[PDB]
Structure 1
Amino acid sequence: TPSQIVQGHNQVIHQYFDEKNTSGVLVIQTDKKINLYGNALSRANTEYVPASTFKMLNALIGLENQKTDINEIFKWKGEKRSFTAWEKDMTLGEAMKLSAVPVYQELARRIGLDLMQKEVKRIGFGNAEIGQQVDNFWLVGPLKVTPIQEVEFVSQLAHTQLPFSEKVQANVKNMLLLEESNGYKIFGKTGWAMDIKPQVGWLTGWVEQPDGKIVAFALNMEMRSEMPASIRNELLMKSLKQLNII
């Protein structure tokens, strides 16, 4: 009789990251319990630049402090942008889904260095340090955050427990809906810091199950320039299915 290799979700999600030849962690939180999966669990308590995941908090601060509103159309004023898809007028929510950093640079500048630093420290996001450059502090340092801190943050958003008004949290949640099917909803925000070394990739968000239960996640992995951006979505969705969260 031969032996059988028996592999549960822990081994499988470790091997999903090995197959991409990169280092990654998936942090899960539900019912105030956090579990770690992937091939690089020490990443879960390591600080990384948040990159575009910071747009969730930029939006909360800008809406709370009435620097913008959910219907405002941010105009494309004519500079060549990183992607043609960004060369259009769009709302905060559209810019969230596209990760359109020039819209959120305009918003960060309206908020201003002083209010932004005070608000980031009030929330206590990551190392709460934004330095002197108001338009890139989430992209190239000095702001850094761990994957565990991101899962705690996004779980609070999902539960309307951040220290912001309930309407502002509801409105930002609505900007983050990625998919709905069969009574499940997936909400989340991607990020990819391409301008530092090592590059960092994120996908932070939560699943709302058909009975209303919230399962939050933070995927964090080392990226390289030849990977498709969808590698993050692929690894997340395969892992969530292995975990029977979807």
Structure 2
Amino acid sequence: QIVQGHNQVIHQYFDEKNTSGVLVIQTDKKINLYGNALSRANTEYVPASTFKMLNALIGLENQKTDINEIFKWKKDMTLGEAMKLSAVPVYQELARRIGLDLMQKEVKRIGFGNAEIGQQVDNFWLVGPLKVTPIQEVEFVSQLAHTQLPFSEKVQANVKNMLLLEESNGYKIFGKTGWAAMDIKPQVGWLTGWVEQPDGKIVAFALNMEMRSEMPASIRNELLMKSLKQLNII
């Protein structure tokens, strides 16, 4: 922390997509950088739907919802079902219950990115003013994985359970995508999360790249999996 890793092959993965990207990896207390645009690692970007992790923690901690509540499609969904889908009404609904005031206090207490939420409680993560670096994101998700955020242990466990993405060969991959696509240029794509390896060890990641509208949403996962293989993390 914080050093370029062995980055030969991974830089070429990003080059092949004709876009700039970084992958930050945090093991215990040590952070390595990979990709073709390493300066992105300490550049601030809007978090986009990666903020849903923190919205859920704040909402659950403050009893503004619970994991069994059904949000009406006015499909009907729980908070957890909505985590992995596009569900801005649901997370937007939650943000309104929290309210601008409690949201700003919580974001300040956690110290997430620039910790600015402005005056519009239901879109500050999508269009600004809140911004965060990929290094900060990996640090945040590492803390969540290890139950070290200053929230209830049970709330952290319940949000972690919402983030399982894919699993294979005894490895579990947890995380959250984001894509700030509308109202923001250049577009920014996130995939932030962690690997739990078969013996229990945790390796956290934050992928951050420039997106274009013609890209498939799976490009983030594709680049992540290739890179984690190269690094022997999976």
Q: Distance in 2 between matches of 1:99 and 1:242?
A: 30
Query: Where does residue 75 of structure 1 map in the other structure?
Result: 72
Contact 1:9 1:242 in 2 (8 A): no
Contact 2:4 2:33 in 1 (8 A): no
Once the two structures are superposed, residues 181-201 of structure 1 have per-residue CA deviations (whole angstroms, 9 ceiling, x without a partner) of 221100000000433000000
Once the two structures are superposed, residues 69-117 of structure 1 have per-residue CA deviations (whole angstroms, 9 ceiling, x without a partner) of 00101110xxxxxxxxxx9010111110113111100000000000000
Query: Which 5+ residue runs of structure 2 have no aligned equivalent?
Result: none
Q: Which moved more, 1:187-196 or 1:115-124?
A: 187-196
SS in 2 for 1:44: helix
Q: Which moved more, 1:184-193 or 1:55-64?
A: 184-193
SS in 1 for 2:68: coil
Query: Where does residue 232 of structure 1 map in the other structure?
Result: 220
Task: Mark the CA change 1:181 to 1:131 in structure 2 (over 3 Å): closer, same or farther.
Answer: same
Q: Distance in 2 between matches of 1:182 and 1:38?
A: 26
Does 1:50 pair with 2:47? Answer: yes
Q: Which runs of 4+ in 1 moved over 2 A?
A: 4-9
Query: Where does residue 163 of structure 2 map in the other structure?
Result: 176
Contact 1:64 1:168 in 2 (8 A): yes
Contact 2:2 2:33 in 1 (8 A): no
Once the two structures are superposed, residues 23-65 of structure 1 have per-residue CA deviations (whole angstroms, 9 ceiling, x without a partner) of 0000000011000000000000000000000000000000000
Normalising by structure 1, report the TM-score. Answer: 0.91
Query: Which 5+ residue runs of structure 1 have no aligned equivalent?
Result: 77-86
Choose the corresponding residue for 1:17, options 9, 14, 18: 14
Q: Distance in 1 between matches of 2:25 and 2:46?
A: 20
Bigger radius of gyration, 1 or 2?
Answer: 1
Normalising by structure 2, report the TM-score. Answer: 0.96
Task: Mark the CA change 1:151 to 1:7 in structure 2 (over 3 Å): closer, same or farther.
Answer: closer
Task: Mark the CA change 1:36 to 1:135 in structure 2 (over 3 Å): closer, same or farther.
Answer: same
Q: Could you tell me how far 1:7 is from its partner in structure 2?
A: 15
Q: Could you tell me how far 1:180 is from its partner in structure 2?
A: 2.0
User: Sequence identity, in percent?
Assistant: 100
Contact 1:194 1:200 in 2 (8 A): no
Q: Could you tell me how far 1:5 is from its partner in structure 2?
A: 27
Task: Mark the CA change 1:15 to 1:54 in structure 2 (over 3 Å): closer, same or farther.
Answer: same
Does 1:135 pair with 2:86? Answer: no
Q: Could you tell me how far 1:11 is from its partner in structure 2?
A: 1.2
Once the two structures are superposed, residues 128-172 of structure 1 have per-residue CA deviations (whole angstroms, 9 ceiling, x without a partner) of 000000110000000000000000000000000000000000000
Does 1:242 pair with 2:195? Answer: no
The alignment of Structure 1 onto Structure 2 pairs a total of residues equal to: 233
Q: Could you tell me how far 1:6 is from its partner in structure 2?
A: 21
Q: Could you tell me how far 1:9 is from its partner in structure 2?
A: 5.1
Query: Where does residue 109 of structure 1 map in the other structure?
Result: 96
Q: Could you tell me how far 1:179 is from its partner in structure 2?
A: 1.4
Query: Where does residue 81 of structure 2 map in the other structure?
Result: 94
Contact 1:73 1:89 in 2 (8 A): yes
Q: Distance in 2 between matches of 1:90 and 1:110?
A: 17
Q: Could you tell me how far 1:244 is from its partner in structure 2?
A: 0.3
SS in 1 for 2:195: strand
